[PDB]
């Protein structure tokens, strides 16, 4: 048993007509002092999935640790390991889950929250998580933390159901991702401007953008807002 | 939350941030700490939103009858009903009140009423819970005296770093100039300040 | 529950979800969340239910008299100094949490306030168990100089999201516009996306199907 | 729950109800209160629906091994005692039974053992078990007899298990039977309460409180 | 708790009430009377917390004798336990709670029926053919939903009482020192002295 | 512990084709000890309907104080007060007692005297009030209530259909759970006339 | 630590430790026990190769397994403590257990058991 | 401090037919007030012509299944491929609740079949392996809504023969498994006016002789 | 609690039991026999925790058995005294402690006198004229140092045992059904089945 | 405790000040809380001194023995296993551990280690007590490749405002300079510091 120190707040993610995208910020918050600000919580497993992670950094970084492993075992004997031996997302995905429940049935969880995203080798695309508890589901769209009570009600007016995915282009798709990370910006007081975001899409491959920022807000109609019921000027 | 008072040359300024939370959740992104209890007289509020709310309404009604009959009250009255108030209620209170005003005879002048009711009489004052994170920026740059340019300047850089550091801080800097010249509304956006 | 308010370029709308919740079940599938402090001042509360209709009925009554002492038009302010003084004297202890909107001979007004007696002016608020999902429409679309048509689709999407994603919510859409000029419009059920779908059977049962032990005639008349 | 057991002439009479419960919401009105721990064995339940469930079948299977292994039918004394030693093993971890091992052997004759989960194991001739224990041995201490015929013994069980079900909020569903003999037990049956209150009441004249 | 039984046949009720008074690890007395005449023909027994059993007892015979002065009239049993439920039911919700719980045997003259009010501290009130207050229910409700018969005479009721004491001695953990009983019909209220062994 | 929870019973309201039904079990009990079978929680003012379930006690003391109430609403007014002015009294004398509750879950039936439209009300222990259309639902087994009411409900029943309809929602209601049950009692209400009966039920 | 196997097989079938453990027996002071119809009777030899002994103290050669058993042996006296001491604590064992002593057969039974189990275990004879 | 635990709400179903049963349960997932899947399989076929499902915590309903379609898997290695019967299924089964009889699996699991007579079976288990074959049994979130129902629809409780004076009970006619799939959407679009927990699709396996079937349905999203 | 009271005469050790087994609300059995023969002439009584009781008694008897055969000898009463006093010492620094009170009654052959032992479940050791445990000694401790002589007759032991049990049944609370009451002498033990009226 | 870490052109200095309190008493006025772990690697502790010294310590001998097999370990490195220490036993420590070394391939590097364990690579740092005061005059004053006369007086004006506002923090300011040049210690006292 524990308690988080170093966190990192929301991850969002949803899958379109090719592929899946996720984003997350870039920030390591120590309780309400936003500390650290180079902090990369989307972590890539060979060239078609992407792990994104949320909740304690000391545990995040131990979950890298163990990606980082895989891949290196993974490749040991195995002359088809950048072929059709290759890591899977399901397989990553199968793997963090197993360790979670594990850890929450000792007791001594790994105090985060996970979607793994990706794309299958026939294709597939491949959206799942996971967290501290072992629990895990599957949706067109995911998101974590505040993300899941901001992000999922405006990344879900565009995919609803499962017949929604194909009639999703990537444009709109990282339009209405990047749209939540702005809306996720303005009410969480634990995110950050700056974060990154990644596509895996089963044409164009891996696709990792550093650096990104929110733009576009509006704060001009702060001007007008006085007092807090009666005050005129 | 992020506030400050500063005495200058011409009078005295008043700084805050714009946001109020409820956990993680920012509840008012524009939210306006700048509170007027009279003509001159203002206040930054910090703690309980209810709590400062009703004092600075309470003190406000205090105020307009003590102008009625004994005409425009000195910032230090105005400090001393702020200070009975939080003093004799302290056990069911949680605020931190900054006060500020400009009276042409004292000039431009500041008072913080801390959580335990005692009152101080300071050339600039910070407070609320992003005010840990620029003590020292702001022992460093304050001088006395300065321009009315200077002391938006030192309010913009000190709350920008305050705002940078804590969570519980954030949205658009308001100000209020106190001056014989009249009061001043200011307002400063996001990609103006972070980019200092 | 979701509510939420919203101003236009003359006036302000609010809007709330249908469902009353006892826990995790539905009590009411198409209560009424919008009550009147006065005829052209409206309003929505989440919280302790008996508290926000207890107390917008207190100052409402209140605002009444005064009108009539005054003989003016009552004013959204008056409501908000009444309400939020009420609630700080019960430390609390009044779970009431509401957005009051109105028009009055001063303009159009949009507050909300906290049960501890706290209170804020806005273009835009939501409250409620859905008051996130709502809140994320209304940062992603709102604007500044909404028409009232704009504004009703506005406030009712948002609550939409509540609907469909916040378990505290569900089943209808109710709103009312006050516009600068006119009179108040209340639109009970405004949207009813959620029809309960034809039973497969029917479940009545063929008289006498009840054993009963002992009859008798009741007396209503004295 | 309401269990009862008692020695008299013909034997051993074994009474239960089979209301399961979790609060104040009734699982089941159809639970196996009395598990035939074999032919000549009989095991009753009260307190964790699974802890008398895995052990007393647990208790079976360990019967089952001393007949193999001594070739002999294993006796009521031993029997109670190895649930009871297990259960003992066990104290202080919050197991929770309450239990009757019933029996009839040419070496003891009709034997009954109390065993619950604090350890204790008693041997006696009259035992009821439950959150509404008290009301059967309210109807039952006050018409027993060792000369009861096969016939009213059934009954006074019966009859005990059903003021039980009336009167205790988490007792009832029906009432499962059983005679014991040296041949082994004999089921008597299932007696929904439902009909059985209203059967009695009339032909006894009893529950004159009630209005039917 | 105390042993507080009531009884209602054909034209009386009885009532039994154990007679001992315990006081930590010691039995005080074991001839201790919980009853309280409220009126010639209406009889209240009482068991609870220590010192509040009696003064609410006594409290509530100084009410009803004064009305039956101010009215030269007798309360019915009815009237007199409504009064019992209204005092228990403020009680319930003041500073510190009386926390006794009743029985009232009374025979309502006008009527001419015996009555048996069961009203426990929180103002709970319910007529009944038979009660109990405390653990003594939980042996005895089975017993007389058995054994009981409207038409019964004050005899039967005698035996039938006697019937649930031995349950209560058989089965119950603490030695209340038998019970004193009371029958209250249209000819008042008399003590059947002889119950040590009837 | 929970006051709502020492004494058991329900009470079902539903409303029909120019009628109503007011139902409720008349069990009384202390946690697990069944006391009494003849514990009926409806009670009428005129030719209004009130159930209450809850703490026995504030059951009892508010029937005492609705007769008294609406007894000189009655002298003052020289008519019968009507279901919808009840249920506003009932809010309003729940609320009165915020800080300081009766542990009750109170149920009004009854038909509007002048314009003959049914009606029907729940409240939650400090006056709420659930104005639904269809049934009002109230007691230990609740859960259970809502569950046969939705399934077997349909509207404008015939006095006859809805008696069988609220008796099969009340009986098997409270056959699943141990606090209620013990016996029952049914109110079928029409304009001109109330008929009562006594339903046959299991007894434990 | 020690488990090294010291009975085996050995290629014509047999398990030499355990014959030459009968070797011992043979070499041991005659035993020898007859059933009549209501009792059964013990006897031992008393060696004579050192006389000179106090007969009160010298350990007997029946021993008392329970007050309804008796055990007699031959072979190495040391051996046959390890095996009456066994014999001794099962014999209460069964009693607490079962509530009821041990039968003959099953007393037997279980010294049988001890017996074989040294046969087959490493690092012991 | 750290709670092992989670609620995942959710709703199952099982009804056994003359020759044939069912078991159904929603597809919603959730967590407090918010959904995380609206489609998220809860009822599994685990081979041998046996449906199950652990409803409560979802991840300790996962576990459960996955250890024994785990166990079905072994059983077939260690006993010459034999058909795992029901009944033996719901003894094993036992044994992987009380294996953790300190540490519970934190759901309501329920089984469903044919038994050794081609007969439909039902069984449902405590969390810690109390098992009992049943006729129906509802499980999960609106159990207390819907097992009420089921007593009276399946079992006709408290039904009797109209013009018997209630002496002759309603016969217990058995349900085909058209009747049985109209009572289970009924039980769900009932459960899912009633219940936050309930919504968005139904899932209904069906076993008989010749294997396992599947049917999907909708449900209110909100 | 239980009542475990014991006494030693002239030439024997007399204990005295309750009989009743009470488990909540219940008395379930009224002949209960709260000892234990350890060897032909001693005797224990012991009283406490519902499981750890017997399982104590019976695994102290097992151990005695084994010795006495072992050994083809009786040990002495101090010596199994004190064997019974380390068990108990081991136990209540142990994981779960055995919660059991005992009275050790032996007639040690070689001395030729009776002898009492008390032992509490700390392993609290003494050897009295006259012993109990829990909260009989309170109301016969001074009764007995009153009336005790140390030349009593067994048949004087069992006026003052009987004096004893009077006192407890008059002013204890709870209803223990009476006692069984052993004699330990040169001869070995023996049951009075004679004391429900002596 | 007031404590940082600031690479600049030639490599890295550490810089701490001289304070240990149990409550309100001043155990040691004079502590040394720069730790040499290896000859070019240092490291700040704060926290349980009990704790932090018994982490260095251990590491301390895990570099003695990683040079006698490998050569000199790189910062990276032993910043790697103060971080395993303090990951894998988080639930008993209470230490924040400031890293850092001189290489003469990677030059000055500054690695942190806060409370859960986790590991963050940085141009520089503060941690204890004090630092909250600091952010916001860190920030704004920070630039890279400073020389060694100007990192010397950032870290001087820094701690001074941190040992200013903190009481936890004071006495004198402590440094070590790490360059291929070589070590070399630094003191100043409060006469000089409190005067800036």
Same mark, same amino acid.
């Given at each position: 048993?524990?308690?988080?120190?170093?966190?990192?707040?929301?991850?969002?993610?949803?899958?379109?007509?090719?592929?899946?995208?996720?984003?997350?910020?870039?920030?390591?918050?120590?309780?309400?002092?936003?500390?650290?600000?180079?902090?990369?919580?989307?972590?890539?497993?060979?060239?078609?999935?992407?792990?994104?992670?949320?909740?304690?950094?000391?545990?995040?970084?131990?979950?890298?640790?163990?990606?980082?492993?895989?891949?290196?075992?993974?490749?040991?004997?195995?002359?088809?390991?950048?072929?059709?031996?290759?890591?899977?997302?399901?397989?990553?995905?199968?793997?963090?889950?197993?360790?979670?429940?594990?850890?929450?049935?000792?007791?001594?969880?790994?105090?985060?929250?996970?979607?793994?995203?990706?794309?299958?080798?026939?294709?597939?695309?491949?959206?799942?998580?996971?967290?501290?508890?072992?629990?895990?589901?599957?949706?067109?769209?995911?998101?974590?933390?505040?993300?899941?009570?901001?992000?999922?009600?405006?990344?879900?007016?565009?995919?609803?159901?499962?017949?929604?995915?194909?009639?999703?282009?990537?444009?709109?798709?990282?339009?209405?991702?990047?749209?939540?990370?702005?809306?996720?910006?303005?009410?969480?007081?634990?995110?950050?401007?700056?974060?990154?975001?990644?596509?895996?899409?089963?044409?164009?491959?891996?696709?990792?953008?550093?650096?990104?920022?929110?733009?576009?807000?509006?704060?001009?109609?702060?001007?007008?807002?006085?007092?807090?019921?009666?005050?005129?000027? | 939350?992020?506030?400050?008072?500063?005495?200058?040359?011409?009078?005295?300024?008043?700084?805050?941030?714009?946001?109020?939370?409820?956990?993680?959740?920012?509840?008012?992104?524009?939210?306006?700490?700048?509170?007027?209890?009279?003509?001159?007289?203002?206040?930054?509020?910090?703690?309980?939103?209810?709590?400062?709310?009703?004092?600075?309404?309470?003190?406000?009604?205090?105020?307009?009858?003590?102008?009625?009959?004994?005409?425009?009250?000195?910032?230090?009255?105005?400090?001393?009903?702020?200070?009975?108030?939080?003093? &004799?209620?302290? +056990?069911?209170?949680?605020?931190?009140?900054?006060? =500020?005003?400009?009276? *042409?005879?004292?000039? @431009?002048? !500041?008072?913080?009423?801390?959580?335990?009711?005692?009152?101080?009489?300071?050339?600039?004052?910070?407070?609320?819970?992003?005010?840990?994170?620029?003590?020292?920026?702001?022992?460093?740059?304050?001088?006395?005296?300065?321009?009315?340019? &200077?002391?938006? +300047?030192?309010?913009?850089?000190?709350?920008?770093? =305050?705002?940078?550091? *804590?969570?519980?801080? @954030?949205? !658009?800097?308001?100000?209020?100039?106190?001056?014989?010249?009249?009061?001043?509304?200011?307002?400063?956006?996001?990609?103006?300040?972070?980019?200092? | 529950?979701?509510?939420?308010?919203?101003?236009?370029?003359?006036?302000?709308?609010?809007?709330?979800?249908?469902?009353?919740?006892?826990?995790?079940?539905?009590?009411?599938?198409?209560?009424?969340?919008?009550?009147?402090?006065?005829?052209?001042?409206?309003?929505?509360?989440?919280?302790?239910?008996?508290?926000?209709?207890?107390?917008?009925?207190?100052?409402?009554?209140?605002?009444?008299?005064?009108?009539?002492?005054?003989?003016?038009?009552?004013?959204?302010?008056?409501?908000?100094?009444?309400?939020?003084?009420?609630?700080?004297?019960?430390?609390?202890?009044?779970?009431?949490?509401?957005?009051?909107?109105?028009?009055?001979?001063?303009?159009?007004?949009?507050?909300?306030?906290?049960?501890?007696?706290?209170?804020?002016?806005?273009?835009?608020?939501?409250?409620?168990?859905?008051?996130?999902?709502?809140?994320?429409?209304?940062?992603?679309?709102?604007?500044?100089?909404?028409?009232?048509?704009?504004?009703?689709?506005?406030?009712?999407?948002?609550?939409?999201?509540?609907?469909?994603?916040?378990?505290?919510?569900?089943?209808?859409?109710?709103?009312?516009?006050?516009?600068?000029?006119?009179?108040?419009?209340?639109?009970?059920?405004?949207?009813?996306?959620?029809?309960?779908?034809?039973?497969?059977?029917?479940?009545?049962?063929?008289?006498?199907?009840?054993?009963?032990?002992?009859?008798?005639?009741?007396?209503?008349?004295? | 729950?309401?269990?009862?057991?008692?020695?008299?002439?013909?034997?051993?009479?074994?009474?239960?109800?089979?209301?399961?419960?979790?609060?104040?919401?009734?699982?089941?009105?159809?639970?196996?209160?009395?598990?035939?721990?074999?032919?000549?064995?009989?095991?009753?339940?009260?307190?964790?629906?699974?802890?008398?469930?895995?052990?007393?079948?647990?208790?079976?299977?360990?019967?089952?091994?001393?007949?193999?292994?001594?070739?002999?039918?294993?006796?009521?004394?031993?029997?109670?005692?190895?649930?009871?030693?297990?259960?003992?093993?066990?104290?202080?971890?919050?197991?929770?039974?309450?239990?009757?091992?019933?029996?009839?052997?040419?070496?003891?004759?009709?034997?009954?053992?109390?065993?619950?989960?604090?350890?204790?194991?008693?041997?006696?001739?009259?035992?009821?078990?439950?959150?509404?224990?008290?009301?059967?041995?309210?109807?039952?201490?006050?018409?027993?007899?060792?000369?009861?015929?096969?016939?009213?013994?059934?009954?006074?069980?019966?009859?005990?298990?059903?003021?039980?079900?009336?009167?205790?909020?988490?007792?009832?569903?029906?009432?499962?039977?059983?005679?014991?003999?040296?041949?082994?037990?004999?089921?008597?049956?299932?007696?929904?309460?439902?009909?059985?209150?209203?059967?009695?009441?009339?032909?006894?004249?009893?529950?004159?409180?009630?209005?039917? | 708790?105390?042993?507080?039984?009531?009884?209602?046949?054909?034209?009386?009720?009885?009532?039994?009430?154990?007679?001992?008074?315990?006081?930590?690890?010691?039995?005080?007395?074991?001839?201790?009377?919980?009853?309280?005449?409220?009126?010639?023909?209406?009889?209240?027994?009482?068991?609870?917390?220590?010192?509040?059993?009696?003064?609410?007892?006594?409290?509530?015979?100084?009410?009803?004798?004064?009305?039956?002065?101010?009215?030269?009239?007798?309360?019915?049993?009815?009237?007199?336990?409504?009064?019992?439920?209204?005092?228990?039911?403020?009680?319930?919700?003041?500073?510190?709670?009386?926390?006794?719980?009743?029985?009232?045997?009374?025979?309502?003259?006008?009527?001419?029926?015996?009555?048996?009010?069961?009203?426990?501290?929180?103002?709970?009130?319910?007529?009944?053919?038979?009660?109990?207050?405390?653990?003594?229910?939980?042996?005895?409700?089975?017993?007389?939903?058995?054994?009981?018969?409207?038409?019964?005479?004050?005899?039967?009721?005698?035996?039938?009482?006697?019937?649930?004491?031995?349950?209560?001695?058989?089965?119950?953990?603490?030695?209340?020192?038998?019970?004193?009983?009371?029958?209250?019909?249209?000819?008042?209220?008399?003590?059947?002295?002889?119950?040590?062994?009837? | 512990?929970?006051?709502?929870?020492?004494?058991?019973?329900?009470?079902?309201?539903?409303?029909?084709?120019?009628?109503?039904?007011?139902?409720?079990?008349?069990?009384?009990?202390?946690?697990?000890?069944?006391?009494?079978?003849?514990?009926?929680?409806?009670?009428?003012?005129?030719?209004?309907?009130?159930?209450?379930?809850?703490?026995?006690?504030?059951?009892?003391?508010?029937?005492?104080?609705?007769?008294?109430?609406?007894?000189?609403?009655?002298?003052?007014?020289?008519?019968?007060?009507?279901?919808?002015?009840?249920?506003?009294?009932?809010?309003?004398?729940?609320?009165?007692?915020?800080?300081?509750?009766?542990?009750?879950?109170?149920?009004?039936?009854?038909?509007?005297?002048?314009?003959?439209?049914?009606?029907?009300?729940?409240?939650?222990?400090?006056?709420?009030?659930?104005?639904?259309?269809?049934?009002?639902?109230?007691?230990?087994?609740?859960?259970?209530?809502?569950?046969?009411?939705?399934?077997?409900?349909?509207?404008?029943?015939?006095?006859?259909?809805?008696?069988?309809?609220?008796?099969?929602?009340?009986?098997?209601?409270?056959?699943?759970?141990?606090?209620?049950?013990?016996?029952?009692?049914?109110?079928?209400?029409?304009?001109?006339?109330?008929?009562?009966?006594?339903?046959?039920?299991?007894?434990? | 630590?020690?488990?090294?196997?010291?009975?085996?097989?050995?290629?014509?079938?047999?398990?030499?430790?355990?014959?030459?453990?009968?070797?011992?027996?043979?070499?041991?002071?005659?035993?020898?026990?007859?059933?009549?119809?209501?009792?059964?009777?013990?006897?031992?030899?008393?060696?004579?190769?050192?006389?000179?002994?106090?007969?009160?103290?010298?350990?007997?050669?029946?021993?008392?397994?329970?007050?309804?058993?008796?055990?007699?042996?031959?072979?190495?006296?040391?051996?046959?403590?390890?095996?009456?001491?066994?014999?001794?604590?099962?014999?209460?064992?069964?009693?607490?257990?079962?509530?009821?002593?041990?039968?003959?057969?099953?007393?037997?039974?279980?010294?049988?058991?001890?017996?074989?189990?040294?046969?087959?275990?490493?690092?012991?004879? | 401090?750290?709670?092992?635990?989670?609620?995942?709400?959710?709703?199952?179903?099982?009804?056994?037919?003359?020759?044939?049963?069912?078991?159904?349960?929603?597809?919603?997932?959730?967590?407090?007030?918010?959904?995380?899947?609206?489609?998220?399989?809860?009822?599994?076929?685990?081979?041998?012509?046996?449906?199950?499902?652990?409803?409560?915590?979802?991840?300790?309903?996962?576990?459960?299944?996955?250890?024994?379609?785990?166990?079905?898997?072994?059983?077939?290695?260690?006993?010459?491929?034999?058909?795992?019967?029901?009944?033996?299924?719901?003894?094993?089964?036992?044994?992987?609740?009380?294996?953790?009889?300190?540490?519970?699996?934190?759901?309501?699991?329920?089984?469903?079949?044919?038994?050794?007579?081609?007969?439909?079976?039902?069984?449902?288990?405590?969390?810690?392996?109390?098992?009992?074959?049943?006729?129906?049994?509802?499980?999960?979130?609106?159990?207390?809504?819907?097992?009420?129902?089921?007593?009276?629809?399946?079992?006709?409780?408290?039904?009797?023969?109209?013009?018997?004076?209630?002496?002759?009970?309603?016969?217990?006619?058995?349900?085909?498994?058209?009747?049985?799939?109209?009572?289970?959407?009924?039980?769900?679009?009932?459960?899912?006016?009633?219940?936050?927990?309930?919504?968005?699709?139904?899932?209904?396996?069906?076993?008989?002789?010749?294997?396992?079937?599947?049917?999907?349905?909708?449900?209110?999203?909100?």
């Amino acid at each position: 048993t524990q308690q988080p120190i170093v966190t990192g707040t929301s991850v969002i993610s949803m899958k379109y007509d090719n592929g899946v995208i996720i984003a997350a910020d870039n920030l390591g918050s120590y309780g309400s002092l936003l500390r650290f600000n180079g902090v990369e919580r989307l972590i890539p497993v060979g060239d078609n999935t992407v792990v994104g992670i949320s909740g304690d950094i000391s545990d995040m970084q131990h979950i890298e640790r163990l990606l980082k492993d895989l891949v290196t075992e993974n490749a040991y004997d195995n002359p088809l390991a950048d072929a059709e031996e290759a890591l899977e997302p399901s397989y990553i995905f199968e793997y963090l889950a197993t360790v979670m429940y594990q850890r929450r049935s000792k007791m001594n969880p790994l105090w985060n929250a996970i979607i793994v995203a990706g794309v299958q080798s026939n294709g597939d695309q491949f959206l799942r998580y996971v967290n501290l508890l072992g629990v895990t589901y599957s949706s067109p769209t995911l998101a974590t933390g505040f993300g899941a009570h901001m992000a999922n009600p405006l990344l879900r007016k565009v995919v609803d159901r499962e017949s929604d995915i194909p009639k999703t282009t990537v444009q709109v798709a990282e339009e209405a991702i990047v749209n939540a990370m702005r809306v996720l910006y303005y009410r969480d007081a634990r995110s950050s401007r700056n974060f990154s975001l990644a596509i895996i899409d089963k044409n164009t491959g891996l696709t990792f953008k550093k650096n990104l920022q929110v733009e576009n807000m509006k704060w001009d109609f702060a001007k007008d807002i006085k007092g807090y019921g009666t005050q005129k000027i | 939350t992020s506030i400050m008072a500063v005495t200058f040359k011409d009078g005295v300024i008043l700084g805050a941030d714009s946001r109020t939370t409820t956990g993680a959740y920012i509840a008012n992104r524009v939210t306006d700490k700048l509170t007027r209890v009279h003509d001159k007289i203002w206040c930054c509020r910090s703690g309980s939103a209810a709590d400062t709310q009703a004092i600075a309404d309470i003190v406000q009604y205090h105020l307009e009858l003590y102008t009625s009959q004994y005409g425009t009250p000195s910032t230090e009255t105005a400090a001393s009903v702020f200070k009975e108030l939080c003093y &004799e209620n302290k +056990d069911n209170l949680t605020a931190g009140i900054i006060v =500020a005003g400009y009276d *042409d005879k004292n000039k @431009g002048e !500041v008072y913080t009423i801390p959580l335990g009711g005692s009152v101080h009489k300071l050339p600039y004052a910070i407070a609320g819970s992003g005010s840990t994170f620029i003590y020292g920026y702001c022992d460093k740059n304050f001088r006395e005296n300065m321009s009315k340019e &200077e002391t938006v +300047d030192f309010i913009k850089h000190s709350l920008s770093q =305050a705002i940078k550091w *804590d969570g519980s801080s @954030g949205g !658009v800097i308001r100000m209020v100039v106190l001056t014989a010249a009249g009061v001043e509304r200011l307002i400063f956006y996001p990609d103006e300040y972070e980019q200092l | 529950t979701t509510i939420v308010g919203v101003k236009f370029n003359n006036g302000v709308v609010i809007a709330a979800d249908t469902r009353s919740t006892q826990g995790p079940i539905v009590a009411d599938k198409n209560c009424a969340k919008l009550h009147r402090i006065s005829p052209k001042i409206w309003c929505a509360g989440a919280g302790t239910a008996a508290d926000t209709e207890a107390v917008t009925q207190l100052i409402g009554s209140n605002i009444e008299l005064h009108s009539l002492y005054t003989s003016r038009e009552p004013r959204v302010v008056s409501a908000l100094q009444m309400l939020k003084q009420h609630l700080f004297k019960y430390q609390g202890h009044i779970g009431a949490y509401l957005i009051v909107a109105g028009v009055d001979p001063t303009g159009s007004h949009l507050f909300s306030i906290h049960a501890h007696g706290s209170t804020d002016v806005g273009y835009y608020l939501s409250l409620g168990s859905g008051s996130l999902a709502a809140m994320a429409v209304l940062e992603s679309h709102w604007k500044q100089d909404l028409t009232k048509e704009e504004a009703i689709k506005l406030a009712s999407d948002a609550i939409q999201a509540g609907i469909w994603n916040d378990l505290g919510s569900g089943s209808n859409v109710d709103v009312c516009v006050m516009e600068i000029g006119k009179d108040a419009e209340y639109l009970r059920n405004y949207l009813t996306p959620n029809v309960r779908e034809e039973k497969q059977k029917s479940y009545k049962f063929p008289r006498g199907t009840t054993a009963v032990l002992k009859e008798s005639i009741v007396n209503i008349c004295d | 729950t309401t269990t009862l057991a008692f020695r008299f002439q013909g034997g051993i009479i074994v009474a239960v109800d089979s209301r399961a419960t979790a609060g104040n919401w009734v699982a089941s009105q159809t639970v196996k209160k009395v598990i035939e721990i074999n032919p000549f064995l009989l095991g009753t339940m009260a307190g964790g629906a699974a802890d008398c469930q895995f052990w007393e079948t647990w208790l079976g299977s360990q019967c089952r091994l001393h007949e193999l292994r001594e070739k002999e039918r294993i006796s009521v004394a031993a029997a109670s005692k190895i649930l009871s030693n297990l259960v003992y093993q066990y104290k202080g971890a919050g197991l929770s039974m309450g239990t009757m091992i019933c029996g009839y052997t040419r070496k003891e004759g009709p034997t009954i053992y109390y065993v619950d989960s604090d350890g204790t194991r008693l041997k006696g001739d009259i035992f009821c078990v439950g959150s509404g224990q008290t009301f059967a041995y309210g109807v039952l201490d006050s018409n027993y007899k060792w000369d009861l015929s096969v016939e009213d013994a059934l009954y006074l069980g019966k009859r005990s298990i059903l003021a039980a079900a009336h009167r205790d909020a988490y007792s009832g569903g029906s009432v499962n039977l059983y005679h014991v003999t040296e041949d082994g037990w004999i089921y008597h049956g299932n007696h929904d309460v439902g009909e059985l209150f209203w059967k009695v009441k009339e032909e006894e004249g009893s529950f004159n409180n009630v209005i039917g | 708790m105390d042993i507080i039984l009531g009884i209602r046949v054909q034209d009386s009720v009885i009532l039994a009430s154990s007679k001992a008074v315990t006081r930590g690890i010691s039995v005080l007395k074991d001839s201790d009377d919980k009853t309280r005449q409220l009126s010639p023909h209406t009889l209240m027994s009482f068991a609870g917390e220590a010192g509040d059993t009696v003064q609410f007892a006594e409290y509530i015979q100084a009410n009803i004798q004064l009305y039956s002065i101010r009215e030269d009239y007798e309360l019915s049993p009815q009237a007199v336990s409504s009064f019992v439920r209204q005092e228990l039911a403020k009680s319930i919700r003041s500073r510190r709670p009386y926390q006794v719980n009743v029985l009232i045997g009374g025979y309502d003259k006008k009527k001419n029926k015996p009555e048996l009010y069961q009203i426990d501290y929180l103002g709970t009130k319910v007529e009944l053919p038979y009660g109990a207050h405390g653990y003594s229910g939980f042996y005895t409700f089975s017993l007389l939903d058995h054994h009981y018969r409207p038409d019964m005479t004050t005899e039967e009721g005698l035996d039938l009482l006697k019937l649930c004491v031995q349950e209560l001695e058989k089965r119950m953990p603490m030695d209340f020192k038998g019970v004193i009983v009371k029958i209250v019909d249209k000819d008042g209220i008399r003590q059947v002295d002889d119950f040590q062994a009837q | 512990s929970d006051p709502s929870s020492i004494n058991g019973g329900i009470v079902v309201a539903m409303t029909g084709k120019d009628c109503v039904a007011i139902a409720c079990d008349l069990r009384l009990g202390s946690q697990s000890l069944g006391v009494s079978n003849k514990f009926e929680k409806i009670f009428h003012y005129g030719h209004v309907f009130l159930g209450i379930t809850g703490l026995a006690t504030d059951v009892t003391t508010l029937n005492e104080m609705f007769r008294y109430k609406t007894n000189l609403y009655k002298l003052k007014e020289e008519r019968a007060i009507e279901p919808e002015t009840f249920t506003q009294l009932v809010s309003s004398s729940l609320y009165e007692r915020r800080f300081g509750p009766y542990f009750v879950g109170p149920v009004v039936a009854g038909i509007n005297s002048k314009s003959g439209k049914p009606f029907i009300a729940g409240f939650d222990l400090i006056g709420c009030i659930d104005e639904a259309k269809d049934f009002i639902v109230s007691g230990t087994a609740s859960d259970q209530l809502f569950g046969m009411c939705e399934s077997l409900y349909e509207p404008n029943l015939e006095p006859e259909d809805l008696f069988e309809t609220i008796s099969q929602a009340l009986l098997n209601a409270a056959d699943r759970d141990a606090l209620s049950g013990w016996g029952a009692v049914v109110y079928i209400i029409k304009k001109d006339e109330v008929v009562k009966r006594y339903l046959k039920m299991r007894q434990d | 630590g020690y488990d090294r196997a010291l009975s085996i097989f050995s290629p014509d079938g047999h398990i030499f430790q355990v014959e030459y453990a009968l070797e011992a027996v043979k070499r041991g002071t005659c035993a020898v026990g007859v059933k009549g119809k209501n009792c059964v009777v013990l006897g031992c030899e008393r060696r004579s190769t050192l006389k000179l002994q106090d007969t009160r103290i010298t350990p007997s050669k029946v021993s008392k397994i329970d007050s309804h058993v008796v055990l007699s042996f031959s072979g190495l006296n040391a051996d046959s403590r390890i095996l009456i001491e066994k014999a001794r604590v099962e014999a209460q064992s069964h009693r607490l257990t079962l509530e009821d002593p041990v039968t003959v057969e099953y007393l037997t039974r279980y010294v049988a058991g001890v017996q074989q189990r040294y046969t087959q275990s490493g690092g012991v004879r | 401090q750290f709670n092992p635990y989670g609620d995942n709400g959710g709703t199952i179903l099982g009804i056994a037919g003359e020759d044939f049963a069912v078991l159904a349960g929603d597809t919603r997932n959730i967590t407090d007030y918010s959904i995380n899947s609206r489609y998220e399989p809860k009822v599994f076929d685990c081979g041998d012509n046996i449906v199950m499902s652990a409803n409560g915590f979802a991840a300790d309903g996962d576990a459960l299944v996955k250890r024994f379609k785990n166990s079905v898997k072994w059983y077939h290695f260690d006993h010459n491929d034999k058909k795992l019967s029901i009944n033996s299924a719901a003894r094993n089964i036992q044994h992987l609740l009380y294996g953790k009889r300190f540490f519970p699996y934190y759901v309501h699991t329920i089984i469903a079949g044919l038994d050794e007579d081609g007969k439909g079976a039902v069984y449902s288990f405590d969390p810690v392996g109390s098992y009992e074959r049943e006729q129906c049994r509802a499980g999960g979130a609106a159990a207390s809504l819907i097992m009420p129902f089921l007593d009276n629809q399946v079992n006709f409780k408290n039904q009797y023969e109209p013009g018997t004076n209630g002496k002759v009970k309603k016969p217990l006619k058995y349900l085909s498994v058209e009747e049985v799939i109209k009572l289970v959407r009924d039980s769900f679009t009932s459960a899912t006016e009633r219940h936050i927990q309930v919504g968005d699709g139904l899932e209904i396996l069906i076993v008989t002789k010749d294997g396992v079937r599947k049917e999907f349905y909708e449900l209110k999203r909100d």
